[PDB]
């Protein structure tokens, strides 16, 4: 789902 894409970046950027 596209709405979750911004969440991946949030995770990967945070870690």
């Amino acid at each position, epitope marked *: *789902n*596209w*709405f*979750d*894409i*911004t*969440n991946w*970046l*949030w995770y990967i*950027k*945070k870690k």
Partner: antibody
Amino acid sequence: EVQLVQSGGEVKRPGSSVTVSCKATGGTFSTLAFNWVRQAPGQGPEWMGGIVPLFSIVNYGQKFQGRLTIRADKSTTTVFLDLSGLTSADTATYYCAREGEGWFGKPLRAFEFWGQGTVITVSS
Amino acid sequence: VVMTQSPGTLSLSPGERATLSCRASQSVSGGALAWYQQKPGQAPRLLIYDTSSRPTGVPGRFSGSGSGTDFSLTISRLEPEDFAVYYCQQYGTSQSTFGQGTRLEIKR
């Protein structure tokens, strides 16, 4: 303040193309999803599409595919909406909405911040 | 996925308890359900996200519940400014859809 300032109202003729802007100021832009949601007179909101400005990852509604173009300008923090082949069924108010940030800015997907709206009257 | 809100118009008294229903044509993945409030002439305001979570600024009288295909918004005490149109929006898939809306008006 996280503000979304859209362009002014416009009267377009049937078949033409319109561009609506969305200046996002005071918050994260690239890694957060913006969305365009329109609302006809007397009806409810209808999600049209979205974009992630970081890598310009767009997501268009199946109804509006082939006729919709959402763009992002990271240098000026602006989101755009290109809608071609306008008809009477496209006369509505177009809102640009950014999602919300939670604990550590977790993208909540749901639309928290909205613009003032752009009134598009598709009539000759 | 087709969202269907219920009822069409909810006529209640100020201070009473309000419950609005949202029914999806298929299961919503991950509880991706949101409740928005809209007053005439304004952009909608996010009241509930992720089924039950509440954004900062929304008063505690609004609470979300449900799972699968049935969801419900609950206003424990209807204030004067709580009467408006309410829209439930799903966003578990790549194609988000809204509901037709529920008109929460004052009974008299």
